[PDB]
């Protein structure tokens, strides 16, 4: 059980956040990444719209089945593609979903062509308030009166769990990523402390127990980069690969973590499959920590 | 992390205990188990040769892949075929083993056979001392001279963690499974609270915290009860059954475990892979706690 009273926000009816057992995983499942094969054009974000209907289904029948909610990652490398990104996710699914680029500038000028729109302010969360964030960011976002964001505590220059703490509460001259979030009218902080390599998923997770420890805030992290770049275990094949990344996925879960990032959504099958089971056995320990389940809809209830 | 100073048994060179982080977990698969289809006769002990020694090198592969040593939990339906197991597994691998049977007086009826010899002593652990031990189960382990025996921590009357404190130490006029164990000339305590299903996995790594947290016992379970007969999961194929597999044997090592009897031999490819992974990032965090490892043979030192 975590110290802090824990924020549960409720993201258009998605819970996230809560002691662990409360409320099972948020799973954030990424389209149009970077060589996503059913796009045919990534600058004009032209797209099969019957292969990316069919993931928004999957992932809905896999959240039916286990009682993991989802989030989509939305993820683009110019305006036009994210802004047509956007507005396909927001008609094709009720979901809500990050919207997301390497780019800030990507990130910015597809937020200002979708402008000021309840169904967005609702469903869309900012990904994400970085180390370099700039008053223009913090501009567009005030502007499009959005109110849950990613903060996002990867950092070379903060590799230890209590410097990511650091980088998100502020130190010296520095405000820190929380508060110039709030600066740009960010109310609800999505806690990511970055996932350097899969042996310091550790560390994430250490970074994930302080957030929850001291601030309350929902904590989550994205391992599926540092897992594809695992060569060794990647070289294997099925099922080693999977196994590997399911070790690596439910870590976080097993140490009280709210939400997870699990990379493309075609690995939804396994990974529904993995972090159901963790959430059942955490639920099935709320008697001995004193938490009562939040909801019915719950893998424990669901998956046996 | 533990309060109490663990107790690290050296098992014919496995070591079994430690704080989290200190000792790679000890991976423990069984062989000649019921339904076992290298066996064509399980009253005569009548098994494929050739195919037992492929997965004894295949353990002995993937251990030296990891870094995870092993132990071999050899199950048996009759005196006889027990006998044969054993003495097959004494001359074909190194590894320490469980003498184990649903059947009691199949333990004790084999134990008689295979004598007090230096080698049993050394490498031979009993299977289990239990709940509804018998005198003449306690003289069967002294004549023989074990020296090692797994304490089946488990009753229907003691499901809460801490009711392991009343199984182990006794209560009333009830002698405890420790006290009841040194009178047998037992000196190491392999202690498993026991499994009933997956969800209550949870319960039995609490049991395995208490028994770490005051008396130093290295703690373990054998989550393999649950999965196979999980028929929702394994009926699913690859990689569905593999990842939730993973996903339960990997829970318990996430909360201070040091050991897993992770059922049949032939799930060792993947098995290894998924704990190896858990391992690394457990003693990755012995970089911010300044725990030691007891080991360079360490799948954080290995896998990648
Ligand atoms: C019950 N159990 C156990 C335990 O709980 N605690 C200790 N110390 N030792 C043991 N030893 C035996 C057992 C762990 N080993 C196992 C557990 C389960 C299986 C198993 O599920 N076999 C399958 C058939 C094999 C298959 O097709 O999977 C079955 O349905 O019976 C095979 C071996």
Redesign the interface.
Known sequence: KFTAQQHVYDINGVKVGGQPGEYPTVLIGSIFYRGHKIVSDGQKGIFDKDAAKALLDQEAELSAETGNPFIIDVLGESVEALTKYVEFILENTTAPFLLASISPDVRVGALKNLGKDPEIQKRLIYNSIEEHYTEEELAAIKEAGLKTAVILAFSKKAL??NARIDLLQGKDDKEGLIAAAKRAGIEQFLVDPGVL???????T??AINVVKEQFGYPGGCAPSNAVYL?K??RS?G???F???????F??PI??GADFILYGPMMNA???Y???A??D??????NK?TGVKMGTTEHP?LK??
């Open positions: 230890k769990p390599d899969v042996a310091s998923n550790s560390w997770t250490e695992w060794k275990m294997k099925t099922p080693f999977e196994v590997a990344g399911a070790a690596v439910t870590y097993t140490q099958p396994w990974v499959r993995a972090i089971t963790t059942a056995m955490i639920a099935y320990n001995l424990l998956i046996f």
